[PDB]
Each structure stands twice: as C-alpha cells, then as structure tokens.
Amino acid sequence: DIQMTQSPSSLSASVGDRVTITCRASSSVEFIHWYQQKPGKAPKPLISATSNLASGVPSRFSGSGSGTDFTLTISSLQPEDFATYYCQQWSSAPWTFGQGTKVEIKRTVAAPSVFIFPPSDEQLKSGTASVVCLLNNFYPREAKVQWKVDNALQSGNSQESVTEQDSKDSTYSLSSTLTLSKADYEKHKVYACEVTHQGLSSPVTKSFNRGE
Amino acid sequence: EVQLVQSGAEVKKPGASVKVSCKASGYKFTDSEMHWVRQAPGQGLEWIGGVDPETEGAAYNQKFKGRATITRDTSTSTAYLELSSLRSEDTAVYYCTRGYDYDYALDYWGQGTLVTVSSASTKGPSVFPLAPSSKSTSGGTAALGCLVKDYFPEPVTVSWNSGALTSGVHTFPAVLQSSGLYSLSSVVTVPSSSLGTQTYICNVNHKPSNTKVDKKVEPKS
C-alpha cells in the first residue's frame, strides 16, 4: 500500500502568514487530493487532483507537486483556517490518506473572563454537587485553575477540558468541574476558583458562599 | 443542495455487527459512487470501501478482511455499511462520502456516525442548568449553560434554542470520570440586559440511550 506522510504534523502561525504543508507518497501517484477538517466536523474537499481548487474554496489555497512530492500552500493565513489538513491518493488500491497536519493560529494574549456556577437544586436533590468554573475566550491555551473550599486548596475532586481554537477570534475556553457529595458540599461555605493566566496581572478569584 | 444524512450513534458489544445508513438527496444517486471512510481520533482517516449504485459493484480495503459489506437501495437513494465481528478497535466515526469523478476529491461527506464497541452498560445523561447569576456576569455579558452528567458512551450533542442560538456557544469536549462515565458542559454568553425577556433552552441528545432533554435555563432566584 502507498504510505502518505505529511510534514510537519502540526504548526502554529500568525494571521497573514504563508503556510507550507508537504505530502510525500512512498511510491509515485498520479495526483493527490487535499481535505480540510474542523474538530467534530466531517472533512471537506479543498484541492482535487493536486492543483484544482474545490468549489467555494478561497484563492489563498493552492496545491502543487508531482510524483511523490506535493505541497499545499495557504498564502495568507486566516483565523477560519484553523483545521487539520489531509492529503489523499487513490492511484493505487487501497486509497490512503496522510496523517494530517494541524494548523493553529497565533494571536495576541487575551485574558480569560471567569464565571462560577454553584450546583443546581435539582442536582442537590440527587445527592451530588458539581461546581463549574468557566474561563472564556483566552489566549494562549495555558491556564491554571485552582479550586479552594473555605480557602483550602483542593486536589483530586475536579476535571477540566479546553475547547478547540475558535475559528473567528482564535481563542480557547476552559471548563472545570469540582464534584463533591451533597454531604461534603453542605460541610463548607466558600467555593472559589482561582485563575492564573499570562493575560492576568494577578490571579482572578470568582467565589460564592453556599446558600446565598 | 446535496445532502448525505447518516443514522445516529450506536453502541455495540464485541463480536456483534452494526449497519450504518446514509440517505442521499439533491443529485442523481445512481450517477455517483458512495464510499465509507472511518476516523479513529487520532489515527487519521481510513478508506473502508465503496459501492457503485448503478451496478452494485463494491470494492474494499483488504484490511477489513471481508468484515465490511457495502450495499445500497436505489429506490430510496440510501447506502449502507455493515461491519461484522466488531472489536474494541472498530470504535470510530464512520463517514459516507460521494465519489463524483476519479479526478475530483470526495465532495460531499455525511455528518458521521460514532460507533462505540464496548461490553459496558449504556447510561443516559442527567442534564442540569448552569443558571446565569451575579457570579456569572462580565462587563454587561452573562454566561449560562447546561451540565450533561454521567452518560455512556459518547456522543452527546447540544444545541441551544433548537439551533437558533449559535453565537457565543462553547460545547466542551467530554471528560471521562473515574466511574468510566462521561460528563460535558455547554455554555453561552449573552447580554445581561435581556435575561428577563429571552428564553434559553439547551437541547441535549444522547442517541445510544435514546435520551432527548430540553432544559430551560433561568436566572438564579
């Protein structure tokens, strides 16, 4: 089978940059196709038969190459170009794809907007208390969330996840959930999430007092 | 407009079989091939095989070792992928995609179907509001959301106001809890000024447990 190897596997660039993604085939192919895929979305055709732009594809995209060496160029990177790009061949069975090249956007530092949510009364009725801390629209991705209950630093009772990069403003968002039993939740007063980030001069604390 | 609409996510036990459907519209179904490609994230994209709807001719990637069978119904413009002797490694998003011409890239792709292969028990989510309050405001904006807790397997989809609200929404990737169940949150930022006049409803769907929940999120009294 023909192995398709892309280089680099990931890159980060600024808006306006010229991006170069290579696709190498283990043996000669007649041409390649390129696809662009956004996270949790189906792939979309980008380039057909090495150099033909797919319908609706902006002119900033172009493809070149022959034999075993091909290149996808994005002439002036835009925030909506955040995606994984795949090359593909079907000159030889089985059809094979490249491993994908993830393109991420570099932008200015943006401080998170911090929001805190106490558990709902419906959840408390079930015997569980989840406290949610939201960090909205920040850059870079690196953020530190600390949970403090009655000013005591928490460990091993939270989980967090970050979104993929925003296609419009190139920021990230993060959600962290502190999960306690209702009995433990009822044992303390002050619930706080303390956020550290490059965009913040000092750590930001959002807190609430249980039953207020 | 060309549309390829697939069947919903499913969970299957190891050794079982799954049949995914792909309903085509907006073009002459018999004039183009229908292919199936899977994606196990992050192990990339793999072609499974395809069918010519006119002739019933099918070709497969040898790797599937005859476990995949691709068929179609020309009277309903639907293609099918059946994968047998399921193994844990078959957990992936399965896409149907149109092969329009040899010189053209696969041009229209279905939304994908996540098939999870597991012996574990399917569990429907509990949906809780993340009410907007004085603790979730930021310079005239308010954040609110829904917490979708304790479900299995993935995926849960979340829309707001039946798809009418999309700006400022963040539906986070799920986290895997110690129990092996998943949890996720979906939030939105809106004007704090109209919390009294606007209605915000999160629509949660977990196809494997046939769960559909619409939860109105109101400001915290």
Numbering used by the authors:
A (entry chain L): 1 to 212
B (entry chain H): 1 to 221
The authors write:
The trimeric serine protease HTRA1 is a genetic risk factor associated with geographic atrophy (GA), a currently untreatable form of age-related macular degeneration. Here, we describe the allosteric inhibition mechanism of HTRA1 by a clinical Fab fragment, currently being evaluated for GA treatment. Using cryo-EM, X-ray crystallography and biochemical assays we identify the exposed LoopA of HTRA1 as the sole Fab epitope, which is approximately 30 Å away from the active site.
Compared to our solved apo-Fab structure, LoopA binding only slightly reoriented CDR2, while the other CDRs and the overall architecture remained unchanged.
